Every structure is written in C-alpha cells, then in structure tokens.
A paper describes a structure:
The proteasome plays an essential role in protein degradation and is critical to maintaining cellular protein homeostasis. The mammalian proteasome core particle, 20S, is a large, barrel-shaped protein complex composed of four stacked heptameric rings, including two inner β-rings flanked by two outer α-rings that are each formed by seven different α or β subunits. In each α-ring, the N termini of the α subunits form a gate preventing unregulated protein entry and degradation. There are three types of known endogenous proteasomal activators that bind the 20S to open the α-ring gates.
Endogenous PA28 subunits are known to form two different heptameric complexes: a heteroheptamer composed of PA28α and PA28β subunits and a homoheptamer composed of PA28γ subunits. One-step affinity purification using an NbALFA nanobody resin yielded proteasome assemblies capped with PA28, including double-capped proteasomes. Cryo-EM analysis of this sample allowed us to determine structures of single-capped PA28–20S and double-capped PA28–20S–PA28 to ∼2.8 and ∼3.3 Å resolution, respectively. Additionally, the tagging of PA28α with sfCherry2-ALFA tag was performed in the cell line that already contained mNG2-StrepII–tagged 20S β4, demonstrating the ability to multiplex orthogonal tags onto different subunits of a larger protein assembly to increase target specificity. The high-quality density map of the PA28αβ–20S complex reported here revealed a composition of three α and four β subunits, different from the 4α/3β assembly observed previously. On the other hand, the PA28 4α/3β assembly derived from heterologous coexpression showed only partial association with native 20S when assembled in vitro. These results suggest that PA28 in a 3α/4β arrangement may have increased binding affinity to 20S compared to a 4α/3β configuration.
Numbering used by the authors:
A (entry chain X): 1 to 197
B (entry chain O): 3 to 231
C (entry chain T): 5 to 244
D (entry chain P): 3 to 251
E (entry chain S): 2 to 240
F (entry chain R): 1 to 241
G (entry chain Q): 2 to 236
H (entry chain U): 7 to 245
Amino acid sequence: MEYLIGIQGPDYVLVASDRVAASNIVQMKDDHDKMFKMSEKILLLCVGEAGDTVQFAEYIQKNVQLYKMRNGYELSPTAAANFTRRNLADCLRSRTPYHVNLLLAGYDEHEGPALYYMDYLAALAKAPFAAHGYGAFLTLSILDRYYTPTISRERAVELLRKCLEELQKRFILNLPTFSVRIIDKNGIHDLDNISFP
Amino acid sequence: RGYSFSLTTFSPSGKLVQIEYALAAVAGGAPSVGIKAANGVVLATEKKQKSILYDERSVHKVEPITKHIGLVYSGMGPDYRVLVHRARKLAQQYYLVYQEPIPTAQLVQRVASVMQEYTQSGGVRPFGVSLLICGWNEGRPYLFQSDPSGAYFAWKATAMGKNYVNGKTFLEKRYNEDLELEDAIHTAILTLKESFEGQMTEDNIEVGICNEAGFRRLTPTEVKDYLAA
Amino acid sequence: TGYDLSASTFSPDGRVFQVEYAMKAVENSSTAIGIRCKDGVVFGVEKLVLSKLYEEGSNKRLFNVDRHVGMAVAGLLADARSLADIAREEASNFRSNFGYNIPLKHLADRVAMYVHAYTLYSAVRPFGCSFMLGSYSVNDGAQLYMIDPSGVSYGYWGCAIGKARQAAKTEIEKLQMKEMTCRDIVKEVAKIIYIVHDEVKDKAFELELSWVGELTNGRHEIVPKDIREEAEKYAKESLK
Amino acid sequence: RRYDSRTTIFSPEGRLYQVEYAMEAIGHAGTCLGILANDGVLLAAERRNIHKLLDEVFFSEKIYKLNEDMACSVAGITSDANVLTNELRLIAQRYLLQYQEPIPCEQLVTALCDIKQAYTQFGGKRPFGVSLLYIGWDKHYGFQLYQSDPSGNYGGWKATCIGNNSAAAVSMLKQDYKEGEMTLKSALALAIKVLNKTMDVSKLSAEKVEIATLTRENGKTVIRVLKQKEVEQLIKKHEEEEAKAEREK
Amino acid sequence: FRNQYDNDVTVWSPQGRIHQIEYAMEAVKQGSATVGLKSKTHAVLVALKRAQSELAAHQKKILHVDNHIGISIAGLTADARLLCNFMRQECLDSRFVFDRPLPVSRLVSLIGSKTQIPTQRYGRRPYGVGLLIAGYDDMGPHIFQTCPSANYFDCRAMSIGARSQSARTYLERHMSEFMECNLNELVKHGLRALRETLPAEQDLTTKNVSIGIVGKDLEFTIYDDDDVSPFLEGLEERP
Amino acid sequence: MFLTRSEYDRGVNTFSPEGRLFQVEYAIEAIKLGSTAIGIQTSEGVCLAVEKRITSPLMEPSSIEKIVEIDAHIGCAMSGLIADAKTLIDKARVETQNHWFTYNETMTVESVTQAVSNLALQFGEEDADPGAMSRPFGVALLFGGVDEKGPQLFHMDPSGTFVQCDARAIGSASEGAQSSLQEVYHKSMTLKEAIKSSLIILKQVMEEKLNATNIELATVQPGQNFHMFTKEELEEVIKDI
Amino acid sequence: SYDRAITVFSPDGHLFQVEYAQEAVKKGSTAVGVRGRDIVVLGVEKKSVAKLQDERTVRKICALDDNVCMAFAGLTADARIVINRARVECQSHRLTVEDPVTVEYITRYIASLKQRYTQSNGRRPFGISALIVGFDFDGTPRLYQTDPSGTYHAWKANAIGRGAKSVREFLEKNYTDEAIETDDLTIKLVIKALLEVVQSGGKNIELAVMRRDQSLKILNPEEIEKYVAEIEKEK
Amino acid sequence: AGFDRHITIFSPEGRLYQVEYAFKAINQGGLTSVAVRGKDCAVIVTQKKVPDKLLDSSTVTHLFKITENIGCVMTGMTADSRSQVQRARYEAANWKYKYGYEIPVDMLCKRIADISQVYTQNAEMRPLGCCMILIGIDEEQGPQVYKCDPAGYYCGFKATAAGVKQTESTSFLEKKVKKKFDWTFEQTVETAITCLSTVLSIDFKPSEIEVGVVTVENPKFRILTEAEIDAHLVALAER
C-alpha cells in the first residue's frame, strides 16, 4: 500500500516514497516521512505493517549512530544493510516478527553509491534500481525500460517522475505527493517534492 | 602471607602461588615417561603397589581417551579420573559435531581449557595432576603435556613425577629422533629404571604405545618380554 | 586452634568438633526418656517450670509428628520445632506418594539424613536438638528411635536424652521393659523422672507424658490426666 | 596494613595493587616485539622455551592469528593468553557475522580490553595476567600496532616491546626507529638488533625467536611466519653488518 | 579470650551455646517495657512508650495484626515492622483461603519458624526483637511471647523490655485475681505492673501509655493517649 | 583504663554483646557529618530549612538540592549522603504516584515516610533480591506535608524508624539546635514566627554568616502546594531578621 | 580497620573506600571546564607523546552524543566503560522519548551508575570523575561534574584531576562575566588555567569546544599554538 | 600454617592435608572391618560393638545392601556412612533404570569415589569421613572386592581391611595370600575371622561380629545369622 522507489546511478542514488499514512479509508496524514537518515550518507526507507516500521527504523538508526559515536567513523552502507538484515532475520523466527519491507540507499567513498533491497523475510540484495509496494509492480517496468547504468541525475529525476505519474494514472490508491532526496559524496540532499495535484 | 592461601590473588612479584603448589603436588606423583618415536609414541609410568593384596587389573594409570589417543598422569589420582572422563566426553562431542576423530592438539587444548576453567574460581582448587597426552593423527605421532596451570606444551620426550629433572636429563642424553618405538620403549623403561628404588616387574609398571593402529596398553606378558632385556 | 570454628573442618586427629559442641547443647536441656514395652512406647519429659507466669500445657516438648508417631525432644526448642515440621512434611509426603503411614525406621532415617546434611556444609550449623521418635503399628510393632545432632539413628529398647541421661539410663536399665505393659510403664517413667530431677538446682517440674500403643489403637496421644495423677502420686510415694 | 588483595579495594592513595602485581608478571615473560613500517607490520618474539626436547608442531608458540586481517603476540600467563585469544577470535567472527565486514583493529582491541577491565572490577575473578600486542591492517587507518596491559588500558605504538628487558628494547628502538622511513626489511633488521641486545644469549639461535610479518598483497592481507632459513639469513646479515661496523673502528 | 565462637550464629561454642542468639536476646532488654495479662474474657497489652525529645511524639509500641490479634514490641522496630507485615499477610491469607480467623497459636508457630531460619544459617541476623502477641480466638483469650530466639511461650501474663522483672514479680504476686477481673480491673493491674518498671521520678501519663484490648466482643483496639485517660484515672499513686 | 577492642562493630548482621548492632548506630552518627537541616510544624503549615554548605563560588548554588518535592502535598529535607538520599527520594516519589494511580488520592505524610522506611529497612537483607544496598542508608530525612490531619512533620533516620515531630533538627548541629528548638517552640506559633526562629537557629549554628545563597528554605501550607522561597523572598526574610 | 570494605561504615560514619577512589581521581591528568555565554570549553592536559606512540588512540575528551561531551580524570579503562554506557543510554533515551538527552539527564545516569557500583561490595567504585558539557534545548550552556561517590553538581567552571586545587583557585580569581564575553576569551581562559599547571603549553594540552548547535570540535594543534601565542604575547 | 582448615588450598608440598584428616576420622571410630576374596565367594566382617544394653542390637549395623547382589561395609562416621549408602543405592537403581542391567561393583565404586572427589575439590562441603568396601559377583570376572576412601581412590583388592587395625590386618592378610593355595567359602570366612580376631586380640563371640557374604552359587548378598557365625567360630576354635 506504500510506495518506495530507488534508482542507483554512477555517482548518486535517488530515492522517493509516498507521503501518505492511512487508517482504513481516511488518509490521516498527507505529509508522512518514511525516510530515516541512519548516518550522513545513508538513508533507510521503510514500509510495512504499522508500528513495526517506525520501531525497527528507529532501532537501526540509534544503533548506527551509536556506532558513529563509539568508533568515530560511519558504518559502510553494505555493513549497515547486513546489520539491519541480521536484526530483521533474527526477529523472523521469534514471536515478534517485524513485518517491514525496506530499501537502504547509501554512498561510500571507497565503494561508491549503493542501493540495497530487503523483504520482510529478511533476504538482502544489492540492485541497480528497486521498489517496494503494490505500486512497484506498475513502476518497475518503467525503470527496466528506460534505465541506463550511466543515467545522469536530471535524467533520473525525470525517470522517477515518469514512474510516479504512472501510479497517478493507474494505481487504485491515491498517492498524491512524493518526497525525493539524493545521496552523493556530499551527503543526503533533499529535493523538491514531486507533487501531482 | 595472604598470597599463599588465595587462588585469585597475584602475589607480589606476580606469582599465582597456589598453582605452583599444585605443580609441587604433581612433582610428588609417581614417575611417568613419554617418548615420541618416529613411528609411534610410548607412555610409561610406575604402578607401584603398597601390597600384594592390591589387584592390578582393577585400575589403570594409562587410559584411552579415543581409539588413537591415550594419556598418562603424575599427581592426584582422583583428579586424573575427573579429567579423563571429561576428555572422553569432549572427544565424543567432537565426533558428533564433525564426524572425524579429534586431533590430539585439539583435545589437549580443550582439556587444558577445562583445567584453566577450574583455577579461576576461588571456591575450587586446581587439579593436582599433570598429564602426558599422546596421539597419532595424520600419519604423525604427537606427545603433549598439560599442567595444572592450564598450559600445554609439545615434547619430543619428557618425564613427570619424582626425579623428573634427572629423568629428563637421562632422556636428552639418550634421545634420538630417528628412534623406532621398539627401541623407544626400551629407552622409556630405562628412564623409569633410573628412579624406581625397587626391582621393577611386569606388575610394578604400566606402559602403553600409540601408532598407526592406535593406542593400546601392552599386556603384562608383553612388558615382561620387553623387561627381559 | 581454628579447627573447631566450622563443621566443614576436620581436626588434625580426625574429629569434627562443632558436632560434638552441638551434642553438648542437649545436655543443657532437662531430661527426657522414652521406654518401649510389648504393648507400645511411652514417652516422658521433665518440663521445668521456669516461672509461675507461664501457662500450663506450654513449652511442650512432646510433639505429634503424625497420627501414629510421636516425637520427644531435648536441646534447642526452636531447632526441635523446626525438625518436627520437617518430620511432619516427610510423613505427609510419604503418605501422599506411597499411600500408607510412614514406617518409623524410614522416618528416622529421612530426618536423620536431613540433620546430617547440616554437619557437612560450612554455611549452616548442625542442629542443636536430639530427639526421640516412637510409634506402634500392628505390623511393625513397638519401635523407639533416637536421633542425635550428628544424624546417627538407632533403635533403643529404652532411651534417655538431656542433662540426666546417664542416671536415667541406669534406672531404665534396671526395669525389664520387654515383658511389661504400658499402664505400668507410665508409672515407672514417672518414677525415673522424679528420681533424676534435682530439687536444689531445678526449682520445680511438671511431668509431661505421652504414649503410643495398642491401647490407643496405634495413635500417639497425651496421657489422660487421671493416669498422669496416679503415676505422679506413685512416683512421689516411691521417692521417699 | 594490607590494601593489596581481592582486586576491588582502592588502597589509600587510590591504587589497585592487584593489577600492578599482575603487571609485574608480564615482565618475567619472554620478550615480544612489534614494529610498524610503511609497507607492513611485524611481530617478533623470543621463544623463552628453549628446552632441547620440545617440538615446534604449532603455527607459533607466541604468535596467534585472530582474523584474516590481524594477529597478536602474547606475553604473560599462557592459560589466560589462550582464553583471551579464543575470546578475540569469537569477537572478530561475531562482528563479521553481524556487519559482514572485517573487525576493525581498534574495535577488537577495545572489546578485549573491556573484558580485561571487567575482570579487574568484579570481586571473585583475578585480573588477566597478560599483556599482548596486536598487529593488523584496517581500511580506515591502514597498518596499526596496538599494545594492551592487564589493566585493560591500550595504546597505539609505532614500535614497542613487552616482557623481559622491555625498557632496554624501548630505549634501543627510540634511537633507531626512523619515523616514516621504515620498510619491512629495515624493521626486521632493527628487530634482530634489539632482540640480540635484550636476549641474554650471545647469538640469537634462530630457533630461540619467532618472527611474523603482516603485509597487504593483491588486496588481501597475508600473515606469514618467517621460516628458519629466512631468520638464519637475517641474523647472518646482522652479524656481518655489526662486525663490519666493528671492523672499521 | 573466647572472642571466637561469638562472630556468627553458625558457630557452636565449646559448651553448646550459640552466643549470637544470646546477644540478640539482649536486644529486647534495650527497649521500653511492655506488659500483657489476660482474663477469662479479655486479653490486654500495655506499653511504656519513649520519645527522642520533648518535641517528638512517642513511638508506636502496640500494633494491630488483625481484628483478633495484635502485638506489642520490645527490641528493634525494624524487625518488629517486618515480622508484623509477615503476620498480617499470614492472617489475610487465612481469611482469604478458609474464611476463618487464624488461630493465634498457629500464627506464633509460623513466627517461630520464620525467626528460626536466620539463627541456623549464615547471613541474616537473628530477629533482635521480642514481641508479646495477644488475641482472642474460639479457644479463648491468649497471650504469647516470642524471643529473638525463635522459642515462644504461652503465658498467663508476661512483661518484656527494660526493667521488666519488677513488673513480672508484681504480676506473679497478683496473678490469681486476674482471671476473674473486669477489663477495667485488668488494665489497671497491667498499668501498675508497668509502673513498677518506670524510674521512681517518672510516672504514668496519658502520653507515654498505650493500651491494647481484645476480647470476645471487642476486636483489637489500641487506646491512644487521649483514650487511656479513663483507664489511668483509677490508679491511685506510687507506693 | 581503656578497653577499645570493639571487634563487633564491623559488618552488619552481627549483634554485639548487649545486642546493640553498631553499624546502624554508626550510620546514625553519619548524618552529623551532613549539613544542618531544621523543620517546624505549625497549624498554618510546616517549614523546612537547611544550610547548603557551598564549597566554592564557582559551584552553581541551584544545583545543591537539600530540600526537594516528593509531591505537591509533601516535601522533604535531607541531611547525610546525597546519593542514597536521591535513592530514597526516588522511592518516595514513585510510591506517591503509585498511590495516585491505584486509589486516585494523595498519600499521607506518615504513609510516605513508612514507604521510604520500608526501603531503608532492607539493609538487613531479609529479602533475596540482589539490588539492595548491604549498608544502611546514611541519611536522615524530614518529611513535611499537609494531609487530612493538617500540617505534619515526620523524621526518618538510617534505621528506618520514623516519628512525627513538632520540630526537629538533623545534621551536624542537631545537638544544640534541638535545645534552641525546645526553648523557642510553642504550638501556637504562626509559620512566619517559625520561619524566623528556624533561620535564627540556622544562623547560630552555621559557621559562615547567613546569606540568601547559603540557605534553602521551603514551606507547604494547607492552601498552597510545596513552595521554595526564591532569592528575593529569602532576601526579604533574612533582612527582616 | 574500617577501610577494607565499601559497605562498612566507620565510627563517625565515614565510608573510606569511596574516599580512596576520590583520591585515585587526583592522580589523573588535569581537566578543566568553563561555561561561556555561547560556548562551553573543555580542556585536558596530555601526559606525554613518548615518541613511539600514536596520539589518536589516547583521547580524554569524548562525545557522548551530538549535544553532549565529557572529559575525565581517573582510571582510563573505567572512563571508557562509563563513556560507552552513557552513549548507549543516550541513544536509548532518544529511542524511548523521541528527544535528545539533556546534560543533567546524562550526568544523572552516569552518577547513578557510579552510585550503583559504590553501594554493593564485590564491585569497586569507578575511579573517575568527569566533566560533562552540553547545550540544552533552550540553548543555555551547562557544565556538570561527577565523582566516584555518585554526587553530581553544576559548576560555572571547574577542574578535576591533579593540580585541580591550584587551577581552581586561579579560576576563582580569574573567572568573571567579562572573560565569558568572547569565545576566544573563554578558550584563552581555560588555556591559561591549564598553563598554570602543566610542563609546556601547546604540546601538553588537548582542548575542545562545543558551540550552540554544532558538533564537538577538537581544536587543531596549530590553533592551540596560535591561542597560546596570543596568551603568551599579552603578558 | 593455615594450609590446613580448607580442603581447596594446597600445601607448599601439595598434599591437601584436610582429606588426610578425613582418613584419621575413620580410625577415630575404634572399629575395624576386613574383606577377603575367594575363588567362588567374597566376605566382609566387621566388629559389632553395642555401647549400651538398651540399644536394639538389630538396628545397629555397618553392613548394608546397595542392591540385591551387592553388599557394603562402612567404616567411619555412622551418619556419613548412611548417607553414602543411600547415594550408592540411588546410583545403583539409576544405573539399572538407564542401562537395563545391574550396576557392576567396579562402576558403583567408581561413581561413589568420583562423588567423593567432587567433595574434596569444592570448598564448602567436607569429605565424608567414611570408608566403603563393596563385595559382589560379576559373571565375567567372578567375585570382586573394592574400596572407596574419602580421597576418591577406588582400587580393587584381593583382600583388605579398614579401621584402626588396618596395618596389622593387611600385614596378616599379606602373609596369607603369599602362601596362596586357594580359598573356598569356609576358608574365606575363617581367614576373615582369624584376621580380625588376631589383630584385635578379641577372641570373638558370635554377637561381637557381623559377617556378610556373596557366593557364585547364591549371588545375593546375605548377612549371616548369629547361629551361622557361631558355627564358623566353633569350627575355628576346634582346629
């Protein structure tokens, strides 16, 4: 029911998510932020069953920031991905499985940009582009169609706009506004919200 | 002073003196000799009995932990049996996990870890026994010693117990790496012959050997045949 | 010499002196005796009256540890009451599991082992009580057992505990309890207690008696007061 | 009177004497040495056990490998050393399981030092009577050498020695060590020099020392123990150089 | 010397005496005196309270466990409060489970067991407090005393605390009349008995006296400073 | 002739001969190390005052908190170990709020004092819980609050014993301050007179000259809640003296 | 007699092992803290390089979180443990109440930990005293101090460790509203105070600042050299 | 010194003096037990001393039955002996439950002895001051005789003694085995009785001794009656 999309590039990773939090039918919030900055150059996008999303996101955020404070350097995106995957996978067997679907986006000085994908069963996969939610089924073909490994960031925001206006055209739920931000060597950069009135 | 009695107290000059006292307990134990031959390793110790009434078959100072490992001790008899049971159990745990016979080095590491585990707690005393753990693995012989401290060392040949220093000197004089076990058993009984203070007989000594076949305790008739020389 | 401080310790000559020191505890106690005869077992206690203020039928040293067995104690009364609670628990557990009244020999063995547990460990002292147990069952017969603070247990045809043990034992020795019957044995128990009581050192005593036997249908019970008065009058008459 | 017992009592003037007595123990131990170079880092130790009838079955008596990217040498009680090395290996592999990256050197040292501090603070257990040197390469800070003590206090050193004659070793290293100019060969020569100075034996036997080097080759760390021929060549070269320096005068 | 054998409860002495228990029994002597006496229809507790200073209020020496049981303490107030909590919970448990008031004899048996456990084990000290337990049950009025040693007694009357031998001898010489007394006569007898313990200069007052009465028709009630004046007025004077 | 063997004072759970249990007595001696605190109970209210004993000028005066609020109805003043005082204050606060949660009412001062006293009693270690300090609590508290019975002042000590007191002084100069309390105090005095008298006594005992900085003063009156005199109010009263 | 166990009180009610730990703190290297109007500066002396040691491993000043930092004088390992425990508590508090920690909250937690170790025998007190600095939500500067005993107190400015008495006397003399007016003046004040007790000026002081809404900055050795040069010249 | 008084601490010569004191505790009892093996039988004899006439002679015994085919004789503290007997019975029954066959005498001795080892290594508890001698028939090995001691040594024997006259008795038995011709059941019992009587000088009567036997014909442990004991005794005197 909630849409996440991520596009990796040569020197960046672009991420966007819908801004809707909802009750049964009422759309309680129009400006919900599903993006959590674990560190300066890594973001965690989370969608899933309510409560589990915020609880797990906050737990991983605070653990990563504790790593920062203790050791003086930030975790790698790959290491953060493996860590949150471990936490999610351990809970899967337990009586309190966090039903959460995540997308982790990061930039490493040594290893460059990275986008990571994990499902509620806690599989992990690096990917060039990925999406979560029912809208992902509609929008993945857009990315698979027009994506290039050498895509520039202007082209990437254009591609993302195409992907989202497809949701506007066809997806049953109303996802009127989306948040967008880029990670690069400089760090997380907020971008203007792609808003379809 | 207070350092003497406590086991979790470093003395001035940094000595854990209760452990040194346990090593002194080992030194009082009966002589035991270990010689690593090229094709085997012999473990020997005196089984001197207080009286004829004692039945030699009842108890053995040389025990097999596994098919290819066996060990001998100098020190406290009860402590020896506590750790021989624990060693057999550790080897079987290794076989359950890995479905391979445990290496001799690994077994001595584990039993030394146990011995170290005992020294730390004040409520317990260190094991007043040292062991010579011999084995044949990967077509190679092995001999090891594990002390009350929880430390282990690898010896080509060595002796424990009474007169261990003199026995070790006799060994380093007599030791040759090229020795076959047929000669090495002779050298071992001679090393013990230094220190009996009695007329050794088949009963008064217990000796065992390891080889490609595995560990075995050669019988009283066998040790009589070797003693005849 | 630090050997006597703890029960975990041994003396260099092979003696655990704390247990002996606890055995000296019961000798402080006033005497108590139990005699076994053909019909059953009779118990008696010399309960010194420390003050007139104290109620009669208080500071009872004769306890019922089950319907068919009774317990008489000498030594620390607190430890004795606790041991009685332990014995009652053991008897109840035996009934619950094995379905019948506990044999006295087994009960003595279990409480004795519980007592013996304490002599070993350093954290906890030996008990300060020595107590006698007695029962009658048509199968087992009359049985009298005594348990020391050590946990030693034995069967006695006649037994005494407390301050006047030795004198009470010779007086009991010249009795021939085996042939005799309980209704005479109560009188002779009263005689022995009155003999061993020291009027100078101990101001006064109230004789406390109990028995178990066929006359009770195998239930330990306190003596009827008429029989108590008869035995006490006989004891005073014999004392001269 | 006695404020040196139970490792949990601050003596007047506020000193924990049990840990100091433990620090006294490492001085008896066989000398261990570590030197940091631009291209690599080495560990060199004196095999104090020189009994004739001892077998060199193991990888090394003093040198232990804790991880792909680091190693350690230990001076102190061998049993506590075995325990600490087992704990170190478990810590490293736990970090690798959690983060799927190699343990940072400082983090591993810090974890074991936390254990060692914990044993000081709580009453029953004795402090670990061990001091050990850590050598490793990490992506963040490259080649690193670390020392630890029974107190649970660690530091980073360009070069240091622990054990018997550690003061003499450090005095020799202070003058000899060239900051930013060492290579692994020069550091090996310096190690042989300081070991010859400290060790009572007039000639380093080449069975009385164990030298191991850590280098990054082809993007993968390699921890290698110099074989007896290599260390024989090293002592021969040092003897020749020292004699030639002698011959000139 | 024999400084040894006194360190802990778990050490027997060479003459079969556990000295720490006796040292605990000394604790009751430290506290202010208390007296308890009974009649055929009533049981009474009376106490002498002490004050740290003139400004301070007098301490609470009589505590109610249940409607049918109440206690008075001599010795450590801490141990008194703890044991009172235990007794109150036992009585509440009996009322919850069986819907009957707990027998007072059984309650003192429970107190004896709980008190005995410290004496034998290393660790917790003996409860260094002496309590007088008074209550009415179906059997009748009852008074018990409990020592810091777990042994307990059943009494016609008893006094515990400092200088209590004087009260005990008064009670003993006057005991015969107590059984047939009215509650007023009985409380007056007990008040005179504790008056024996006081210093000659000191005298009974409304402030320093507390009275506790329980009977067939009367639940346990502590008559406080104002309420003791009816009972105190009858008393004549010091002899 | 000196006999100084003691040999029984060390270690709680040891009854010395004559059964005195000296560790608790030494803890009761410990509060005399603390700063003097003083409480007066009146019909108009109960007031609490204490000397801060500022070590250095750089230390912030507000940080020293020797009078605190258990709740609106009850406040406390403490003398002795600040740390175990903080522990007991926490126990008092949580117990007051638990009472509010369970019964929708405000605890009495006696009940709160009993609640903290029960915690203080646990040095005996009758409970098997590990998290109870073996040593007695080396602090004495003065609990002052207006309850159903009106203004009440309760005293608590390391033993855990507690009593109501019309006026009490704890701390170093409690001896002598209590004599001054005994002479000055009469039940009829208003809270203004009580404040003035308590500050007179504190001025007498205190080594340093009295100033708004070095004292802390508070009052809880039936209409009002627990209130601390500010710098200005303290200035007004210490000027009035 | 009465100095061998933490639990036992002495006659006159002195707990002496905690006093001995407070004495152990005095052995440690000096640290100083001062509250500027918009800055809090935390300065710590450096014992010595030893010429074969890497300075980065040894750092007395540490950041518990974005808005709080501490410096310590006392046992280094104990300080490391306490720092880690306070850091995890900081992140846990943010997790629990979705707000950043206040300086008084974290100093309360550290004090409670030290108190917990004092109260029970079988554990020794943390032989450290700490100087915790941070900016609260209102933006007021905060400086707190903690000791092995477990009491905590706010200080306008303070020092801990060896020479604390001398440097705090100097600071009682020097400190005023005028000195706190400038951030550079605050830094210069703490530098002069550490200069009061230290062998050499630039080499042997490690200094750091926290600004109103910025992370901790450890001043570069060149910056410290410039500041001591400005201080040295003015004399 | 102080190197004694705790079992854990080692002497500077590494001797653990406390267990050696436990060995003395056996001799403190003043009783002796002898066990001798035969070709088809094993016997245990020990003194039976009744201090008082009042004691029931049936109850006092040092011979106990661990299981149907194993018997033991305990020498030392009576209470520790009974406790070790109970532990042995539990070990035997648990062995039967787990492994489906009667425990061997050697394994029973080994289990009891290693328990004694855990006693002599852990601090708080003390070694049980008793010695056990077990007799049974094993089908493979024939008769067996074994002894546990407080240390944990459990060696098997042809013949043994324990108690105060152990050295004299083993000197006597050593001569008899040296002149080995055989031992049938009667000669086995006669050797045991002659050893005990000679070392003690007692010249026993049937009441003073209690004998227990196992035989390959009748494997069950049985304690012979006074009549059987007198039958053996009279045969000794006649020849």
